[PDB]
Amino acid sequence: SFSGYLKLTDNVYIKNADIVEEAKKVKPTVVVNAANVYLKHGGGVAGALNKATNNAMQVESDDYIATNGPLKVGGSCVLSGHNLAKHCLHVVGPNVNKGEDIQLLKSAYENFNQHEVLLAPLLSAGIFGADPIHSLRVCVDTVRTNVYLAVFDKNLYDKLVSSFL
Numbered sequence: 001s002f003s004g005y006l007k008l009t010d011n012v013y014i015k016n017a018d019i020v021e022e023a024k025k026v027k028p029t030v031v032v033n034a035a036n037v038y039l040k041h042g043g044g045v046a047g048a049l050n051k052a053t054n055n056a057m058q059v060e061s062d063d064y065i066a067t068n069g070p071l072k073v074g075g076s077c078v079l080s081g082h083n084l085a086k087h088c089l090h091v092v093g094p095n096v097n098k099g100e101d102i103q104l105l106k107s108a109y110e111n112f113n114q115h116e117v118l119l120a121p122l123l124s125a126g127i128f129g130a131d132p133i134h135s136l137r138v139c140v141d142t143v144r145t146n147v148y149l150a151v152f153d154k155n156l157y158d159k160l161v162s163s164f165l
């Protein structure tokens, strides 16, 4: 199972790790993708997860969008986890760099509550522009299921742990 995680709360765990390498080692039931409404996995966590699937995640995502249309900001969809997980939960956190409502971050984390255990990144962090310290706070105050957070950046991981209330 998951190893080397620091326990933050009853159900939230954190590790300085690349989520792609973490998914390949663990092969969790659910890996969370930091998705956009179009499921266009170009950069950040999405680009890295998609590249690990040899673009199979993007091909599957384009078929999903052709059938269903775009997701809502704060929404999610369950697709295949390919070689990374049983399932991928594509969750859309607000992109602050696109002027999206930061209050949607709580709605985005609520999607995690439909899964008993997940491997996930901090929503809206990185190229999505939100404060990762705020994202971790919303995560621990919203998610009740078991979430294993992978933070790629060592310096950010240290800052998150040392500032955790």
Ligand SMILES: NCC(=O)Nc1nccs1
Residues within 6 Å of the ligand: 017, 018, 019, 020, 044, 045, 048, 121, 150, 151, 152
């Ligand atoms: N290029 C790899 C990468 O970005 N991995 C990440 N793991 C967690 C968040 S970002």
